[PDB]
Amino acid sequence: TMYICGDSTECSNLLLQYGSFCTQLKRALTGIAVEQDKNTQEVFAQVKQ
Amino acid sequence: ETKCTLKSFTVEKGIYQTSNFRVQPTESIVRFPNITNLCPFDEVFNATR
Ligand SMILES: *[C@@H]1O[C@H](CO)[C@@H](O)[C@H](O)[C@H]1NC(C)=O
């Protein structure tokens, strides 16, 4: 809601009915961000000693 | 705010990126350049003849 209408309230008011569309976009990026830390952990942290 | 973002009355354990539900009234400002040209209504209404 910052990238699309941004500071325009009148615009934001008609972005509300999309709703789940913004959720899908946030959810997908969040999943990627988490995976990136998992990848690092799997490669380097072979030994906990 | 987190509960609204996730569309739920219960939130799990973890760190969440939330949406901006904060509102402020803001100001309203209009600016124009100096008006110095005027208009010669003096020669029309203040005519000596
Ligand atoms: C006519 O002269 C008067 C007195 O100086 C002035 O107040 C008025 O604005 C003038 N009229 C116009 C159209 O400029």
Side-chain angles (χ1 to χ4, degrees), chain A residues 2-7 11 13-41 43-46 48-49, chain B residues 1-7 9 12-18 21-22 25 29-34 39-41 46-47:
Chain A
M2 186 173 180
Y3 177 80
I4 307 185
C5 302
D7 293 353
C11 180
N13 285 343
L14 67 143
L15 183 59
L16 185 61
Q17 69 268 30
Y18 282 88
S20 70
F21 282 90
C22 287
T23 298
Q24 285 182 294
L25 296 170
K26 284 159 87 277
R27 185 175 294 159
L29 291 172
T30 300
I32 293 168
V34 173
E35 183 170 313
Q36 296 313 302
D37 286 298
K38 182 176 178 180
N39 287 339
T40 300
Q41 184 69 6
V43 174
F44 290 97
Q46 299 304 322
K48 297 290 181 68
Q49 308 299 307
Chain B
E1 185 165 295
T2 299
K3 286 180 182 177
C4 290
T5 299
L6 298 175
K7 303 294 189 296
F9 282 66
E12 293 296 319
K13 175 168 163 286
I15 183 167
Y16 297 94
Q17 174 72 64
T18 66
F21 286 88
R22 290 97 67 182
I29 299 294
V30 60
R31 303 281 292 163
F32 292 108
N34 286 350
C39 189
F41 285 113
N46 281 15

